[PDB]
Amino acid sequence: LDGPYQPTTFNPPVDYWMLLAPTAAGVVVEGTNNTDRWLATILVEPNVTSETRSYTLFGTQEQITIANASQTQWKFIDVVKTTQNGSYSQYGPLQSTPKLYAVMKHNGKIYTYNGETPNVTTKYYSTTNYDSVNMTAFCDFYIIPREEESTCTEYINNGL
C-alpha cells in the first residue's frame, strides 16, 4: 500500500498492482487508447434484476446493462471495445464482499482478480498496445508493488 491517490487521468505504469478502494457502486476506473482498444471498469450494486441505465463511456453517452443476485456483494464488470463507439462486451466477473478492487499489467497481459472474493482467481488478458494505453480513475486508489502479489489477494478476500 502506497497511498490513497485521488481519481485522475494519467499513464498507468507496469509491474505494479492498482488497489482501487471505491465508496459505492457506479464507475471506478477506465482505460483506453482511443484508436483500437478500449477497457473500462464499472461496479454494480447488490440486488439487481437486470437493468439498463445510461452512463458516459469515455465522454460518449451510452447505455450499459448490469445485474446482481447477491444481497450484500458487489459485482465488478469490465467492458472492452475494438473501435470508437463500436462493440461493447462486458466481461470480467468479480464479486467483492469486503469491498476492494485491484488491477495490474505485466508481460503485456493485464492481470486482474476474477471470481468471488473468498475464492478469487487472478486471470490475465493478452494485450499489445497496453504500454500505449491511458487510464482514468473515478475514485481513490492505492499503489502496490507486484512483489506483494500474495498481499493483494488476501486484501480483496478479507483485507478491510
Curated annotation (Swiss-Prot):
Record's subcellular location: Virion
Q: Which effect does the record note for changing residue 102 to G?
A: In strain: Isolate MMU-18006
Task: Extract the ranges annotated as region (Spike head).
Answer: 1-160
Mutagenesis / variant outcome for changing residue 37 to A: Reduced ability to bind sialic acid binding
Residues flagged as site, Binding to sialic acid: 37, 126
Where are its TM segments located? none
Q: Which cysteines are joined by disulfide bonds?
A: 139-152
Annotated consequence of substituting residue 82 to S? In strain: Isolate MMU-18006
Function, as annotated: Forms the head of the spikes and mediates the recognition of specific host cell surface glycans. It is the viral hemagglutinin and an important target of neutralizing antibodies. In sialic acid-dependent strains, VP8* binds to host cell sialic acid, most probably a ganglioside, providing the initial contact. In some other strains, VP8* mediates the attachment to histo-blood group antigens (HBGAs) for viral entry.
The protein depicted here goes by the name Outer capsid protein VP8*
Q: Which organism is it from?
A: Rotavirus A (strain RVA/Monkey/United States/RRV/1975/G3P5B[3])
Shown segment, full-protein numbering: 65 to 224 of 776
